Amino acid sequence: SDLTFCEIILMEMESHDAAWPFLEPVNPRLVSGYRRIIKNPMDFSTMRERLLRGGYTSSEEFAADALLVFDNCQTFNEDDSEVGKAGHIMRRFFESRWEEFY
Ligand SMILES: CCOc1ccc(C(C)=O)cc1NC(=O)c1ccc(OCCN2CCNCC2)c(C(=O)OC)c1
Ligand SMILES: CCOc1ccc(C(C)=O)cc1NC(=O)c1ccc(OCCN2CCNCC2)c(C(=O)OC)c1
Secondary structure, three states, rough: OOOOOHHHHHHHHHHHHOOOOOOOOOOOOOOOHHHOOOOOOOHHHHHHHHHOOOOOOOOOHHHHHHHHHHHHHHHHHOOOOOHHHHHHHHHHHHHHHHHHHH
């Protein structure tokens, strides 16, 4: 019930123009080296699956999961890569919205 704003963030991030790298889990078969570099994958649909089924005890580890998305993105992709550029936009969107609400 305090995750009222978490679904608003998630719903806006899902529909955001720059969300295309994070809408489904990275497919390690198509992304060379992803499996070995990123040991805790996270993506918006997994956050969706987890939020619906209810496993977010506070807005705290919602943010932890979102921040994991953008931390994985910066670990794996160069800042000037196409996926990197989208990640930065998504990460600033998230930070921006999160402080607008908390
Ligand atoms: C090449 C580097 O690939 C990555 C390297 C690193 C990372 C991360 C997150 O670190 C991410 C990615 N790529 C993606 O996520 C990603 C996702 C979807 C894509 O299209 C699927 C089209 N499909 C979508 C749903 N509706 C129907 C059509 C493509 C693509 O077609 O690219 C060729 C790439
Ligand atoms: C090259 C690495 O690409 C990825 C890297 C990472 C990831 C993820 C999710 O992690 C995903 C992807 N790509 C996909 O899933 C994916 C799916 C379908 C695709 O075409 C089918 C569509 N069809 C009809 C319309 N016209 C074009 C051809 C293509 C593709 O290559 O289009 C040229 C890619």
